């Protein structure tokens, strides 16, 4: 068995709902057939946004969306995406159809429809200070000025509100190949000119490390900590060498264990980066923000490698489950995370093909776990069975929240595909006795995936395979499971 | 230095008597007539990153974009090819009076946005030392070697004092 | 009331007994009337060491003793303190008498008699590499060599064993006024030549920071972490300006609150220094060693200021209690601590005047708390009443250990002198029901002290002012108390 105690009366902090965030780009058909179809598309849409996807994302309770993010942030000139949609700039490679039909107004609208927070990354790499400054003016300024007046001409009278503003992305890489020392000087300069207009209050976010560049974190905190509200972090889960990453389906048992081992490395990264932040920011004012994570495979065979289209197995669900747990465990510092990406691109929650769409296993996890959004983390102490071929990994990952309505949610991942997993759970600090419903998400195959032909192969089912002896809750988890139990007091 | 020759920018004073009649099109044409390689140096000192980036787009991009479409309006349908691209010149001097440490950071940044369009493949060249500034060479190699295809060097033969 | 939970089945780590360590110098009558009296002194002694003190320290279960430590370490030439006692070097200032009658042999013998670990600091400041190297040879080498043969002439046949070896002390100050960058280079050099002879295994300790020189810690870990087994830290509790510190007795109520507030700053220091060590030593291989702490007052009026003689109130006991608790809370990294000093000097456990000695309040705490030595820390969660004039301080400090024999010890300090303190304690994770004995240490006056005339004004008494409702333990703590409860299962 695996022993777990849940000190149900010991709150350990708040799980900022923005941990359940997502991110989209203009490299592929993420923002081009996946979401934006156009006001004049045959696919049922709301102001150009297909409703099948809206419905699903609303249901998932998406908390925040990051755009542009990734490389695109530091290529984009935002003025290219405002004004009459008919007469916006148009970049097109015939070997890329960027028509800029989706720009600032369209994005803000989207976030309003979804009821999620907008998170925008301005352009440091190839942009100017005035350019970025003007973007914030354009969006947030209630008064009279060229930018604000232009916002109104373009059809939005009142300013918008925006919190999360990224001052560049990927600046160590495709955003300028900058040294930390150098990005830090630019960050300080740029952020100076991003003002709080009206009663908008900006959460300024500096580009943080790639993977284990602890040097980057050290320098940014040493040089810029006073001038930032948050610091980002980027880590993808890659089974193989960068030159041959491995496939999304039809992969070996080795590729399963290695994929999860890579995913769990997130804990080490977050710990070690947090450690450094602690040195320069002991009271943890500054948010850690993991605005790029998720699996990165080779593209489905016979698709363009540059379009990054990949499938989504039960494997992908385990990664998502375990990684979210890791963020939970670190919610004292980690306050936002953004999986890559939203639609048709890398570890997406949704895939589309014409008017057909499906929910990926990854969707099901975000939907199942939304009970943790803005919940309270509970003191849980545990001893877990090892699994995997060297006893490398934990068989089980588990987390406990207390929703606002008093209810208790306990999520559990079984990482062994080969066999189920026993879990005795002692609950201390209770009031009455408690009753318990349960959902589980599992699969027959190791690469269990949803297709457009069979889109329901892998979906949540009821879970009843557990006894609850008023105090102890012994539970019997399926192989490759992700499971949420809901306890009501009395 | 592009667009209708008759309506291009004009600096003139003999207290620069430049009419911009010779610009990008004229130069690329020249290299075609001579059968020689073109080698262009972009503007780091007083230029921007988008400016330099767009220059390469304008010249080498086969697709449809503001810059490429503008090349065609200006009378060249197909893109040109270019290998040798210098990311600034004389940056220790009349090109910004930069420390090496500093030019290197700009070099890295600028070169990032100079893309290979069509089957054009760029040979990116960083501004190297004046004469015996071995320090400059040391720093540029230490900080930027991975991001450059070549490094420049400048030495004139001067008989007397400057 | 103050709520406390004790997850009695959740071990958080081991409290290294060396946390209960002490330190003495050739400073006043610490080594000269306090401990060493000489073979033919009228004070009853064992090979020159007074038995009243031996007896009391054996009782207290002193785990480790550090000598020379402080400034003296980096002035001492150890060869001056070996050889026929009759013909050893002799330094005398007539304005202070060093006869070197207490040297290496005498010290090693002392540690054998006490059953405590020896901890020696070699001389970096004014010493040489061969000098320090030879000291270790002399002590630990079983074979045939000038140093080992000299040990035997001087009357010790077999080598001794020693773990804890400090490679300089106070090197930022009276040990060379060194930059960290510089001490680190010397540390690396010196430690190179300190060899493990026979099956002796050295625990090499580098001189760490004074108070909040986080820079020092950063540099030493960055440059020398691989070459050290431990790193030291020094913080004294000083009520007033360095020029006018305040007295040991007859002090204001303000001086009480300020004294405790200064003492508690230890938690910040240990946290922030640990934070930095975590960055360069994530697995916490390297011990943090707080080898100088304790109150520092003005000397008792009309005694030599250079001798540092000070009294010891219930206040001093509170500081000792609370500081030890802080070390408990940090036993993942902190593995040794050494209060300054042992006898007649600063915050001593014992004072002497000829053949008369007394136990200070500080002694009583070390004796009462020895139940924590090499014990296991238990998960305790608490919500405590504030006290003090601004609500500054916690009314209560509390800690829980599990002794080897299964028994559970809970120590509690009430920092309010003005009123007692209520404490509800819930005990989870138990098997049987439990019974509970109790000791407390308190006083009538805020400066309650022991004198040679009345040496028992302030001593442990039985404590019975608590009800134990076989699960909850409600307790009623005296003003200015230090209290230990012992629970037996069944
Ligand atoms: Cl929130
Ligand atoms: Cl030990």
């Amino acid at each position: 068995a695996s022993r777990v105690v849940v000190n149900a009366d010991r709150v350990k902090g708040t799980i900022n709902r923005n941990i359940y965030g997502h991110f989209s780009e203009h490299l592929g058909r993420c923002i081009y057939e996946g979401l934006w179809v156009g006001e004049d598309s045959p696919i049922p849409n709301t102001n150009g946004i297909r409703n099948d996807v809206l419905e699903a994302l609303k249901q998932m309770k998406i908390p925040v969306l990051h755009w542009p993010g990734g490389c695109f942030a530091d290529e984009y000139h935002w003025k290219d995406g405002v004004g009459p949609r008919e007469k916006r700039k148009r970049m097109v490679n015939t070997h890329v159809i960027e028509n800029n039909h989706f720009g600032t107004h369209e994005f803000m609208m989207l976030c309003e429809l979804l009821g999620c927070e907008p998170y925008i990354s301005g352009n440091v790499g190839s942009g100017t200070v005035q350019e970025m400054s003007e973007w914030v003016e354009y969006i947030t300024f209630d008064g009279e000025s060229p930018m604000a007046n232009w916002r109104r001409e373009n059809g939005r009278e009142k300013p918008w509100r925006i919190k999360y503003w990224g001052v560049g992305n990927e600046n160590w890489g495709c955003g300028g190949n900058m040294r930390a020392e150098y990005y830090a000087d630019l960050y300080r300069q740029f952020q100076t000119y991003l003002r709080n207009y009206g009663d908008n209050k900006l959460h300024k976010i500096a580009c943080g490390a790639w993977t284990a560049d602890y040097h980057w974190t050290e320098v940014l905190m040493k040089q810029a900590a006073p001038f930032m509200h948050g610091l980002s972090l980027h880590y993808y889960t890659v089974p193989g060498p960068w030159e041959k990453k491995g496939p999304a389906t039809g992969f070996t048992t080795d590729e399963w264990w290695v994929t999860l081992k890579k995913a769990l490395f997130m804990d080490e990264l977050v710990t070690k980066h947090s450690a450094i932040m602690d040195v320069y920011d002991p009271d943890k004012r500054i948010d850690l923000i993991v605005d790029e994570w998720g699996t990165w495979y080779d593209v489905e065979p016979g698709t363009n490698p540059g379009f990054l289209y990949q499938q989504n197995s039960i494997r992908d669900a385990l990664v998502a489950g375990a990684t979210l747990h890791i963020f939970h465990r670190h919610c004292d510092r980690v306050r936002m995370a953004n999986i890559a990406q939203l639609v048709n691109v890398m570890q997406s929650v949704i895939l589309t093909e014409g008017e057909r769409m499906l929910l990926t296993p990854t969707y099901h996890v975000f939907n199942m776990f939304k009970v943790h959004q803005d919940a309270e983390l509970l003191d849980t102490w545990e001893s877990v069975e090892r699994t995997g071929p060297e006893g490398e990994l934990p068989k089980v990952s588990v987390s406990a929240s207390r929703a606002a309505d008093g209810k208790i949610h306990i999520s559990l991942c079984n990482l062994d595909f080969e066999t189920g997993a026993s879990v005795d759970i002692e609950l201390r600090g209770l009031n009455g006795g408690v009753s318990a419903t349960g959902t589980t998400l599992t699969s027959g195959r190791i690469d269990g995936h949803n297709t457009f032909d069979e889109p329901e192969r892998v979906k949540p089912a009821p879970f009843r395979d557990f006894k609850l002896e008023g105090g102890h809750l012994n539970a019997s988890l399926p192989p490759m499971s992700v499971t949420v139990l809901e306890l009501t007091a009395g």
Side-chain angles (χ1 to χ4, degrees), chain A residues 180-181 183-184 187-188 206-209 214-232 272-288 333:
Chain A
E181 298 80 336
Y183 170 72
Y187 169 86
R188 286 167 57 141
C207 177
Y214 305 112
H215 170 78
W216 184 279
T217 301
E218 199 154 28
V219 169
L220 260 298
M221 294 296 297
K222 184 169 196 208
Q223 299 290 269
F227 309 96
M228 70 180 78
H229 298 279
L231 181 68
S232 73
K272 288 203 187 196
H273 281 287
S274 292
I276 295 168
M277 296 183 82
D278 281 340
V279 165
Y280 298 93
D281 177 21
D283 294 332
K284 312 196 177 133
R285 176 181 59 84
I286 297 164
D287 304 345
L288 183 54
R333 175 69 78 173

Side-chain angles (χ1 to χ4, degrees), chain A residues 16-18 164 374:
Chain A
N16 190 325
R17 65 175 305 208
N18 289 348
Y164 309 107
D374 270 349

Side-chain angles (χ1 to χ4, degrees), chain A residues 4 31 82-83 164 202 222 238 249 407 465 475 488:
Chain A
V4 181
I31 296 290
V82 304
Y164 309 107
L202 278 182
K222 184 169 196 208
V238 183
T249 62
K407 286 221 186 68
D465 198 349
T488 332

